[PDB]
Amino acid sequence: TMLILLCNVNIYAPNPLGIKDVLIAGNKIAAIYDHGQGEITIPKQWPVKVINFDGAILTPGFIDSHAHITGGGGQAGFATQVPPVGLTEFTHAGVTTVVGLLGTDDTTRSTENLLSRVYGLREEGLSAYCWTGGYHFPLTTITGSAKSDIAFLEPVIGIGEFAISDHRSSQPTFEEVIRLASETHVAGLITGKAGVIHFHLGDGERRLELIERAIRETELPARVFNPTHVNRNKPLFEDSCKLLSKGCHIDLTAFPAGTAQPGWEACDAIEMAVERQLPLEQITLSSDGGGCLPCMDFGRASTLGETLVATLNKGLSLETVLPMLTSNVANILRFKNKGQIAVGFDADLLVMNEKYEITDVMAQGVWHKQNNQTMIKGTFE
Amino acid sequence: TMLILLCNVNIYAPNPLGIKDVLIAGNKIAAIYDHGQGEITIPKQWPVKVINFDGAILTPGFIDSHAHITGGGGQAGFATQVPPVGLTEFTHAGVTTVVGLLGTDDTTRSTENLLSRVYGLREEGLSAYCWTGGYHFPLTTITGSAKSDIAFLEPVIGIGEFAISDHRSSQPTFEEVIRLASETHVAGLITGKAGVIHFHLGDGERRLELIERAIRETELPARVFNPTHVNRNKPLFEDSCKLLSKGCHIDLTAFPAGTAQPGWEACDAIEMAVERQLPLEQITLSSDGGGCLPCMDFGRASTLGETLVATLNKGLSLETVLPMLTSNVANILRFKNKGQIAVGFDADLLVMNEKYEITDVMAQGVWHKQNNQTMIKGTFE
Ligand SMILES: [Zn+2]
Ligand SMILES: [Zn+2]
Ligand SMILES: [Zn+2]
Ligand SMILES: [Zn+2]
């Protein structure tokens, strides 16, 4: 029903708030206040559903900035094209907002395909956005330019998974890179949208030279450049840590456990960042859901949960790591109503048990999972 | 604030519900129930503005399907280009949703201009959509076709205002017209949007020939063809009335003052339709706000309210005419959450005094005018 009162929840906003009651009205968070020792009087004509959670952890929904919502793959033949990722693979992993992109195969797939799937997910009740462009240069777009795509297509927030330091890249020059960045950046001012360029990094030894040079040589703000897969190898991760002091957000990939290659598992990279006193608000985590992870090995949204369990199991506190999946991502992507359990924000939230497994998932004030039961399924699941 | 309680309100939903209290949650209507007297016990922890309206009339907000949000004109030289229409021109006149369009000048003005203004008005708190094309063939678009415009640009709902039977038209062929109709119609299927073509009618003796012919010879549903300015002359009005038996929605223009010229004032046309027992659900009214009205007059949204008052002073009932500004528009344009005062619909509401003047205006749950005072101005008003 439209009003939902969630009683007795231990809120991580991601900041710890202690035990609270939270009123949801429509798709928004309407109130948060201390859990009174008795009950309240609710006027009878108002339809309100009341649920007592007996102190269970309450969290913002995860914001996954890197999902191949159309499916990725296609890098070892046509038969390796991954089908579309279903609604429940996001929601049951706790992802209430997704940002889709094309990757390596931006030749058989189009931005048309990508944006249609975005709207699909929106009709099914998920919050969804996307990146235009892909790995390659010139860019795959709808209207012919990144600038026009970001200006005129509401869900498109930036340029994404644009490849550098990778054998599958377009070997882009510095001039090409800073022109692209100038286009997302200015379109972001025009629209109020992220206006970032989300870089795919591979294993090339030039690492982040292009980004380091752009920031040094140019007036482009550091935040415009958002590299991902930064834990994929060790030298890269070191450079990415250094990159933090310029102002860049950096994005770890939650690789399926024991597949982090010769780089760092995301949980180890997080622990290292904490030990080292790095600015944790500039670090994010994404799943690479629907992507292939080449030597075939498939990305899925549930690795966010597992990375989080693995960090907690090391003795890191929930408040230290949770912003990496929530408020840190909302910050760089300019999702002003997401990523926080606070009055006026969207009612995107998760409930977890003592083991940190996600039992309940609400998106836009509507339950997609409840008491560990799927409430909402996608059209063809 | 997040919850607002409207007490003692005489609801026309548009259909008369009598005296109610109405609870607003965020941007939605959440409860409607019998007023009664006595307590109302609201929890102290829940922020709720309570407002008493002493029995005053409450209606849905007006939906204006035909507004030059960028300005129209340009038909008697370059100095006659109307400037953009400020937010309050819509809200002070009770328009909570607008559908913008290009007119005669789709040469120096672009869909990019139009769409940018849609997004402008959304940022200021109005609900706004638009038609792509404009008078002329080939169409003025962003992407290169209406099909892909309607499919990929969320606020674009169809094609309009496409000219037939006018000296300023492109003299389109029947083949040209039904091809455009197939385009919006199919895009309406793909997207769930209106999928209509909104035609400008001129004073040509051929009138609605091309639409009559499309409906008779093709499989295209009648609702796809949506002529406006049907009251501009008397033969055209007779023919448009006949067209209602085919299933089409027809659109009256609220010409100002005594400017209906050789046709009918919208108030008379409406009276005639009620006397003739035509299907009134298929009749709408739009302002042409920001347009030029050459033989030269100016459209403005406040003609809507005037036409309403003029029709009630004829002895017509509010519930008979009100749907023509609200629910009948929402129906043809497939604005499933607009046009009605009902639980689950968007909180777009007007309050009127006994003289049918609009004293309050709410758009998406936010007050733009309260107690005869302007609460929100456009960025440059
Ligand atoms: Zn990648
Ligand atoms: Zn990827
Ligand atoms: Zn016209
Ligand atoms: Zn017009």
Side-chain angles (χ1 to χ4, degrees):
Chain A
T1 98
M2 286 205 138
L3 275 71
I4 315 198
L5 181 72
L6 320 175
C7 297
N8 189 18
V9 283
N10 187 11
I11 297 174
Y12 286 80
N15 268 336
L17 288 186
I19 302 309
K20 301 282 184 185
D21 294 346
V22 180
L23 181 59
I24 309 308
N27 74 313
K28 288 285 188 185
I29 295 172
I32 306 167
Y33 56 98
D34 290 321
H35 180 42
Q37 209 269 340
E39 320 95 330
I40 26 69
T41 300
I42 291 161
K44 80 195 190 65
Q45 312 84 325
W46 296 13
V48 182
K49 232 287 165 191
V50 174
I51 308 171
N52 307 262
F53 282 98
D54 199 21
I57 287 158
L58 189 81
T59 271
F62 303 155
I63 299 158
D64 193 347
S65 69
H66 195 118
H68 296 275
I69 66 178
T70 63
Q75 314 176 43
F78 291 107
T80 63
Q81 296 192 349
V82 174
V85 179
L87 178 70
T88 63
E89 289 290 280
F90 295 115
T91 60
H92 290 238
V95 183
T96 50
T97 300
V98 81
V99 191
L101 30 64
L102 306 185
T104 309
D105 180 13
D106 60 4
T107 300
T108 77
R109 303 182 180 265
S110 56
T111 309
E112 286 85 3
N113 295 140
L114 177 59
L115 185 53
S116 302
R117 185 54 177 165
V118 169
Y119 284 122
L121 288 168
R122 284 148 74 131
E123 293 167 9
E124 283 174 342
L126 204 68
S127 298
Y129 296 92
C130 70
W131 306 97
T132 189
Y135 263 38
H136 296 114
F137 189 93
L139 295 186
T140 300
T141 73
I142 291 198
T143 60
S145 107
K147 244 280 192 59
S148 284
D149 272 27
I150 296 157
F152 299 127
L153 311 174
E154 177 272 326
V156 172
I157 66 183
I159 293 165
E161 164 145 71
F162 188 72
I164 62 195
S165 293
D166 194 290
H167 70 97
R168 297 108 90 208
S169 84
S170 288
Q171 302 292 327
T173 60
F174 172 74
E175 286 68 32
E176 291 170 344
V177 170
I178 67 177
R179 186 78 99 232
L180 300 179
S182 89
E183 288 175 21
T184 17
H185 180 49
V186 170
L189 301 186
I190 283 164
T191 58
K193 300 190 286 177
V196 329
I197 165 158
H198 185 80
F199 289 100
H200 161 97
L201 267 294
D203 288 316
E205 77 203 344
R206 296 170 298 176
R207 279 159 218 136
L208 301 154
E209 275 168 14
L210 292 173
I211 292 165
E212 293 152 7
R213 190 173 158 196
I215 291 170
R216 185 165 54 245
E217 216 185 287
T218 261
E219 315 73 12
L220 286 152
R223 62 165 295 290
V224 169
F225 311 86
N226 177 234
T228 196
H229 312 316
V230 295
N231 56 308
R232 68 183 296 131
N233 72 70
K234 296 180 179 168
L236 177 61
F237 181 66
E238 287 305 312
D239 284 7
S240 297
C241 286
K242 262 158 184 75
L243 195 63
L244 296 156
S245 64
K246 310 301 192 207
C248 302
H249 277 241
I250 71 186
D251 185 59
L252 303 163
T253 300
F255 298 113
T259 80
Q261 217 183 356
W264 300 111
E265 301 276 305
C267 58
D268 304 335
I270 295 178
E271 168 173 60
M272 290 168 77
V274 165
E275 150 144 39
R276 286 181 198 191
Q277 304 307 103
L278 299 175
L280 304 176
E281 71 278 7
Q282 287 165 240
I283 304 190
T284 58
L285 182 73
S286 67
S287 71
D288 208 356
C292 73
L293 310 183
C295 319
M296 207 169 220
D297 184 12
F298 294 103
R300 67 191 156 282
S302 61
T303 53
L304 301 166
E306 299 165 343
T307 283
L308 177 63
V309 166
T311 61
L312 300 202
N313 200 40
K314 290 166 176 284
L316 297 172
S317 280
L318 182 59
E319 61 262 33
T320 297
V321 182
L322 187 54
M324 303 187 182
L325 284 176
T326 58
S327 58
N328 291 350
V329 186
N331 185 274
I332 181 62
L333 303 198
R334 300 190 172 154
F335 293 158
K336 78 133 202 171
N337 282 299
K338 306 279 184 208
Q340 287 182 60
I341 302 291
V343 169
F345 284 59
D346 288 347
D348 291 343
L349 56 79
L350 319 175
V351 172
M352 300 162 182
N353 70 14
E354 77 293 333
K355 292 285 197 264
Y356 309 109
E357 161 184 24
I358 295 143
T359 57
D360 312 81
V361 179
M362 171 185 291
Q364 308 303 109
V366 177
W367 292 115
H368 288 239
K369 182 185 222 171
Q370 213 170 16
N371 308 318
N372 233 32
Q373 289 242 63
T374 314
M375 307 302 288
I376 294 174
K377 227 112 163 170
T379 317
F380 304 104
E381 288 186 286
Chain B
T1 196
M2 289 281 308
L3 302 162
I4 302 176
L5 183 56
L6 314 176
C7 302
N8 204 4
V9 83
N10 187 12
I11 308 197
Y12 286 79
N15 56 288
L17 309 180
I19 315 297
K20 296 296 177 163
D21 293 349
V22 179
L23 176 68
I24 304 295
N27 75 329
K28 298 289 192 172
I29 304 171
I32 302 163
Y33 56 81
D34 283 330
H35 176 41
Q37 295 136 40
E39 77 315 319
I40 316 161
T41 298
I42 295 165
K44 326 95 213 149
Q45 302 106 312
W46 293 16
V48 185
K49 293 187 81 121
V50 186
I51 308 175
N52 306 100
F53 282 101
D54 197 11
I57 290 157
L58 182 146
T59 76
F62 299 164
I63 306 167
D64 192 356
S65 71
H66 192 120
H68 296 276
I69 62 178
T70 66
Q75 340 215 356
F78 292 107
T80 66
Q81 299 195 340
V82 183
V85 184
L87 175 76
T88 66
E89 285 290 299
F90 297 114
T91 67
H92 189 272
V95 182
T96 45
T97 303
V98 70
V99 188
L101 37 64
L102 299 182
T104 301
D105 189 8
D106 52 1
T107 301
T108 88
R109 299 178 182 270
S110 60
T111 313
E112 290 87 347
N113 295 142
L114 178 57
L115 188 53
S116 300
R117 194 51 180 169
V118 164
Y119 287 134
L121 293 175
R122 286 175 187 208
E123 285 170 13
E124 286 179 343
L126 200 70
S127 302
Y129 297 90
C130 64
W131 304 98
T132 183
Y135 263 38
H136 295 114
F137 187 93
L139 287 184
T140 295
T141 65
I142 300 193
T143 67
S145 79
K147 173 53 76 60
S148 42
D149 270 34
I150 306 315
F152 302 120
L153 306 158
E154 174 270 330
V156 176
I157 66 175
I159 295 166
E161 55 164 337
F162 188 72
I164 59 186
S165 298
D166 196 281
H167 78 282
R168 296 158 298 173
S169 92
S170 287
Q171 304 294 331
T173 58
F174 172 69
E175 284 80 12
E176 285 169 355
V177 183
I178 64 193
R179 168 74 37 88
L180 298 173
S182 82
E183 283 191 50
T184 18
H185 172 53
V186 173
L189 295 180
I190 286 168
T191 59
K193 301 190 283 197
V196 326
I197 173 167
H198 183 79
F199 293 90
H200 155 97
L201 263 287
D203 281 333
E205 204 92 21
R206 292 171 296 177
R207 289 166 209 119
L208 300 156
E209 263 177 24
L210 294 166
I211 293 162
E212 289 152 354
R213 193 173 157 209
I215 294 167
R216 175 203 317 131
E217 290 187 38
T218 80
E219 310 80 8
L220 286 152
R223 68 166 285 292
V224 176
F225 307 89
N226 181 227
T228 185
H229 315 322
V230 297
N231 55 312
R232 66 181 301 121
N233 75 68
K234 296 192 203 312
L236 176 60
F237 185 63
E238 284 308 328
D239 290 353
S240 297
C241 291
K242 295 183 217 312
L243 203 74
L244 295 165
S245 64
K246 305 311 193 185
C248 302
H249 272 242
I250 68 185
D251 185 59
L252 296 164
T253 295
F255 302 115
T259 81
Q261 251 48 320
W264 298 113
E265 299 300 332
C267 61
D268 293 337
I270 288 179
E271 188 182 40
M272 289 164 67
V274 179
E275 292 171 333
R276 303 165 169 204
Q277 311 187 88
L278 297 170
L280 301 174
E281 67 274 16
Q282 291 168 227
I283 303 176
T284 67
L285 178 66
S286 65
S287 67
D288 207 346
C292 272
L293 280 37
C295 197
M296 200 195 319
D297 275 302
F298 311 118
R300 46 171 210 288
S302 55
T303 56
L304 296 161
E306 290 165 25
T307 291
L308 187 61
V309 173
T311 72
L312 297 145
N313 304 8
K314 282 156 172 282
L316 296 182
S317 276
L318 183 58
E319 69 269 35
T320 306
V321 185
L322 188 55
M324 302 179 180
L325 303 183
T326 58
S327 55
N328 300 352
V329 187
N331 185 94
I332 192 56
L333 308 184
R334 289 167 64 62
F335 290 161
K336 281 133 150 45
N337 279 313
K338 280 164 188 318
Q340 276 183 70
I341 308 297
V343 173
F345 288 66
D346 286 352
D348 301 338
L349 317 175
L350 312 183
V351 186
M352 304 189 313
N353 67 28
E354 335 77 63
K355 238 131 283 175
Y356 308 118
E357 288 173 355
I358 293 144
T359 59
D360 313 74
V361 180
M362 170 184 290
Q364 300 301 279
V366 185
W367 285 118
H368 283 238
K369 185 182 188 183
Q370 263 177 303
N371 303 350
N372 296 308
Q373 307 294 341
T374 298
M375 305 300 294
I376 314 290
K377 289 149 282 194
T379 308
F380 301 97
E381 292 182 285

